[PDB]
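Reviewers asked in the last cycle whether our approach scales beyond single polypeptides. To address this, we selected a multi-component target totalling 1652 residues and predicted its structure end to end. The input consisted of the following lines:
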Amino acid sequence: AVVSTDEYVARTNIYYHAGTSRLLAVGHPYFPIKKPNNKILVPKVSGLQYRVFRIHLPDPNKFGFPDTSFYNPDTQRLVWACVGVEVGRGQPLGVGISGHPLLNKLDDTENASAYAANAGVDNRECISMDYKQTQLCLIGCKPPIGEHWGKGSPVQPGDCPPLELINTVIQDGDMVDTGFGAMDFTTLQANKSEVPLDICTSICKYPDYIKMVSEPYGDSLFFYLRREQMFVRHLFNRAGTVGENVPDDLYIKGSGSTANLASSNYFPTPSGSMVTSDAQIFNKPYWLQRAQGHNNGICWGNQLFVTVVDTTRSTNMSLCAAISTSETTYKNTNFKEYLRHGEEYDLQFIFQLCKITLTADVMTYIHSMNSTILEDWNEDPLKKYTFWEVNLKEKFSADLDQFPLGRKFLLQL
Amino acid sequence: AVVSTDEYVARTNIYYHAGTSRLLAVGHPYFPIKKPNNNKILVPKVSGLQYRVFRIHLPDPNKFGFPDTSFYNPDTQRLVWACVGVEVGRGQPLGVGISGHPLLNKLDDTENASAYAANAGVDNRECISMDYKQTQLCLIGCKPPIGEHWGKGSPVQPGDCPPLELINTVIQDGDMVDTGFGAMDFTTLQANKSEVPLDICTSICKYPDYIKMVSEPYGDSLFFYLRREQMFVRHLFNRAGTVGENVPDDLYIKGSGSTANLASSNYFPTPSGSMVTSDAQIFNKPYWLQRAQGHNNGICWGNQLFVTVVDTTRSTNMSLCAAISTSETTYKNTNFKEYLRHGEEYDLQFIFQLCKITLTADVMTYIHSMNSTILEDWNEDPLKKYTFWEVNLKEKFSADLDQFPLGRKFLLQL
Amino acid sequence: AVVSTDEYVARTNIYYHAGTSRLLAVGHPYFPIKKPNNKILVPKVSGLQYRVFRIHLPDPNKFGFPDTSFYNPDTQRLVWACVGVEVGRGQPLGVGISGHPLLNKLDDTENASAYAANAGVDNRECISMDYKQTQLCLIGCKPPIGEHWGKGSPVQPGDCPPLELINTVIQDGDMVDTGFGAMDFTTLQANKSEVPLDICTSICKYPDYIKMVSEPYGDSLFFYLRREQMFVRHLFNRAGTVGENVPDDLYIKGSGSTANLASSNYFPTPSGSMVTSDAQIFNKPYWLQRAQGHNNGICWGNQLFVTVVDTTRSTNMSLCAAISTSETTYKNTNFKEYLRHGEEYDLQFIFQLCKITLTADVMTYIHSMNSTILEDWEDPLKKYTFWEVNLKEKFSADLDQFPLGRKFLLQL
Amino acid sequence: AVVSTDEYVARTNIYYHAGTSRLLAVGHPYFPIKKPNNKILVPKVSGLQYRVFRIHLPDPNKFGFPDTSFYNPDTQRLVWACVGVEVGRGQPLGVGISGHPLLNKLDDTENASAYAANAGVDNRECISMDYKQTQLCLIGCKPPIGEHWGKGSPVQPGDCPPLELINTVIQDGDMVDTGFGAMDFTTLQANKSEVPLDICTSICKYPDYIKMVSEPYGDSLFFYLRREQMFVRHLFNRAGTVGENVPDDLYIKGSGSTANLASSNYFPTPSGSMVTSDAQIFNKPYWLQRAQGHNNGICWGNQLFVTVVDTTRSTNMSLCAAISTSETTYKNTNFKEYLRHGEEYDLQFIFQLCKITLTADVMTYIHSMNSTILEDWNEDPLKKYTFWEVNLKEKFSADLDQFPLGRKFLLQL
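The resulting structure, written as structure tokens, was:
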């Protein structure tokens, strides 16, 4: 049976403060910019992406403490334990808009309109919408897990793909669900125009809270917060050949214009409503004094993983340049337009040192839980994923009161 | 007089944890698909507005192996389970779904009319869609829940208005919840077949009968219940068919010319659920049934439970399409086929407590009056007429609570 | 000098539970259906009507108690007292719609973008709106007293009717305020097209809380709850000759198309916004453990009056019957449309018995307060129409057996 | 190692009250009225500007106290401490409107709309929008710090300017972020028609809370409230040549009408939603009894800086004047129309006298913190910016009971 860390991990009264300072990212909000080579030139930085920071801590065993009388190195080892965190967001509150120049939309079904689509071969329209609002922060010593609907195990051309639920590690840059569902658009929509431009060739992953919480050791989730909201803004219709005809027992055949049924593939456009300062999750200190799982904040392997989504600062900046200044009158051809998005972060942590007695039972338990720890204490499995590497090896300071999160921690212990 | 369970049922320190990890359903949100040459369904109907009535089977304690049996004397006592905790996980992103009818019976928009409408033709049906009234609920009990709807009552010129009766019946898995058009039996009360959206035009929309369930003398049907719903009118519309009841002359002054003939007066609103938000969630949150409203304080008579869940805050139909030919350079509508699908994810966790009953003469006669089958089972299925999402927990019981999250929460709560 | 009832009404430790069970009503939401005969074939059941129940409690003096050691049956008398109540509502939450096929509406003034053409002979249009949301529950031993602006008495034809604040007794079926004001429409609007179809000939009364509270004995109101909410959805204009010209000093004369002022009689269409379960009043027990007035819950004369308004369950349901079933193609003439509404109620009470000593001071005070109380030891309320509820045979002593009784025992 | 003020500053039980009692500003909401010359006849007063009050206090060492037995002048000095503040606001609540006669706007991408035949060149419309709602009140003994995107380090004409996060001192009259992002429009948008008229040639700055809380001594900020909300009202589209074509991987080529993609530079128009009285920050006393940082309200140099933003009292009033009064019918040409905006402020403070012993270590610490402190105790460096100078040298009063803020303070004791 699994046992809580507090049952075999002794905590000490030594605390440290580590911060990242300003972390900045600027780029296009929809797609990466590159010129003909596949190398990027301006990365894709959007308000609806996951930011998974892989934080590296100094090795406490080899760390140069001012004194070493608080433990016996011959029969004990040291590990860090997170007891406080603060995610700092700097940019002003705002709401960003994304859309597709050729969205697959036939006509508006919410209410009869003056003009209706004339059928034809291509009815795609230029449509944009604001997305579902989200805010989540997961902290753990292992990568988070997400779930999405992808193509299942494998007929005629155009038949409905099999549908399956897949779990995969969330990475930096993975798009969050946006009101169209958590699904693998690239493969489940061969049309390539069902959803806005920034997700039509990407996967929208949603955290697997059930799986992460229910796992035996609770490494993946010490603490987590979430907030979501959305309401339908407009009700639209889809175009294309009908996959399955409506059963003839659900309606009575018409005559004349109504002889042919209109498309019944309805889809709404989400909307985040208001972003307000009272509903914010960030810029506040979260105390991890007691976690849900068995891992009570121990950072096994000298690592942390802070996943953040914040769509309440997703304002894109219109940006224009003039080809020539000789024009005294405005001309559309004379000005080039652009888009950009800026993200600002600042992570503060409070770490409490802990020591572990290496008895036979403890060693066997630690080996069963994860064999890597014992080898460490004397290739990287996670070095196939993209994380925002954050290095704090040279940024530990023991005088807590010198920093704001340190002062807050001291006021409350 | 009827005694509370805690008056003749003794509780113990034995606790257990049972789980139903990752129940999953995928189907079409409006109707079941089936090849014409057969009635067998290739894709079930799985909408976000359906009742999910799980029928949970427990391992009967009387024939359940324990490490110790000193807590009861077998020949003069019988064991039972008592639900002291529950949680209904919901592992999908929040979202709102859309429904509609390609030939909805809508004549005019009577909200901001600017000129008197023209006379209706032979057919005026239009393709219209709308989101539904938001709803959440969770009923837990040892008997199937009871719902209500307005059906065709006991009995006539052809076309006369059907009489209305209030009918009580057992809610089953797959039934439709009221969506803002009232809890009625559309199939029989609307011969038009185009009054309401496509997913309820031939279905009964039931509503739980809280009054009747709570007035139940034994309180079996309802240990614990939650409900939260909201709605507002998005649009105001008109109906097209002829009028069965003319407006009385005394309610208006006769018009002339264009206004000589009255427009239809059968107004109907289109519901709207407004925002779905995380703070107002009912799920992913433990519930302690330590004090039931009725006399039955969570005793699972017959080794059964019934967890009814409705959750329209995670209804997000996902459009997905497949191309007939991939060797295409320009977009063609005829080259793509469009589909709708909907997926639901559940995770039920329970904490059960063992209880024992002394089989004295008074207890035996009282239990016989309560339900004759208890004693007989303590030696055909009556509920073999309904469709429930069967869940089997005979092999899912484990004593160590701290190994599971709900167990850890329960331990911390003591 | 009026003394609280507890100064001469000594309470006991006897409690009873009375419940009406399912009370059901079905009918048309706008007007009563009747053969063009005066008999009503289908009543008018709407979600904006008052439901004024009249509960008849059993005569405690003649009641067959099992024990009578708690009073002297020759120098004392028994009276019922209400200490708990619960109003049960069955149907699902929803919103209804009302409208007039020929409503008096000229223009949409909210966002007018070009000066309108002069009104013709008849500019009436089909328009509907959802009404202001309301909920209330008044309980007392006398019928409630509402108010409305009726036509007073003092005149050239077409002159403005005098206005007066008339005070009357609310009755079962009277329409509640809908957002157009609490006024007598049938006399103050000879147009018969100013307001929707279900109130264009009725009186929309509003409870007179000020007067009912200021009543000396506090009979009319032990306990009351209220909630309302509305906002303007559209800003329309009225049609018809101008009764009172706009003063010349409030504007500068227009020229050309603007030479003739547009109508300046605006009116908004109300909207009740959202109905939610968190804001619900009903399906919750109320404990009448201290009344505002002097009458502290005593049911004089063995009566109660529960007035209920609930516009959060006003869902009208569309029915449709097919004249011919052999049609393979849809035709409008082949289907007849109907509207109906269903209201479901379930009242529950807890009654505590009380006894009163029949001394000289008590006799004279009760006489000066209400003589019929002493007479019982023509019915003045015969004129009015109430939903008569009979609870003489529904009394029981086992409070455990009923849900409200269990809640009362647990909490008190 | 930085020590909080209350370690070397001995507080006393002497309190004073100072206030302005009224402050008015009237001007044009959109732009200053230059004289056709350079003199500004009417300033630019808007509800979306920063109000940075530079408050001057009497020098306590030279102040005329009725008694001086609480300190010895030779070995001690005196300094003011801000223990209370209140920012009054006069005008009624309301919301103002801004717009551009020639805003850059091509289409309405929310829904398929109906438009006139395209002009081809100069597709600019007269558009207006209400701004994002905001409120804030920073109080410190140094001017605040703000952040905005500007033109960064160094190119064919029309290329996208580089972006950079710049920190600059906020000044009176500097505009606040409006929902279009905190950026230097003047240089980042050569079009001069991307945003409304009152920010098309200005810098929208946002307070830099991260820096203003992370500076060591915490002088710039020992109090701050913030309250902001917005939502997207409309979803428009830009007009102009595309600087970055959509990658071909994100869509399928059209034919006929959809041969050429529509503009994909979307922008939303903000909306502050409802201004309400219960959500008000002002007309309410704040007590500065526990500063976040190390400066616990000490006003070094006898100064303060109160920065206030309030967009919930931004009602512009339209005025009209008649060229000639003899006309009997209405004519447009006979009436001129103007706009004006009026602000009202009333600042009240509670000050507590303090004293510092001039020992060796104290003097060295103060010199390291700020050299000028010891010289002041015998040209202006901060007199390079613009501040709404407030002179309270003659407003201090020792009777707290005679003023409303003092009466409120005495209840708190």
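The first helix of chain D runs from residue 185 to 188. We regard this as preliminary and will revisit it once experimental data from Aim 1 are available.
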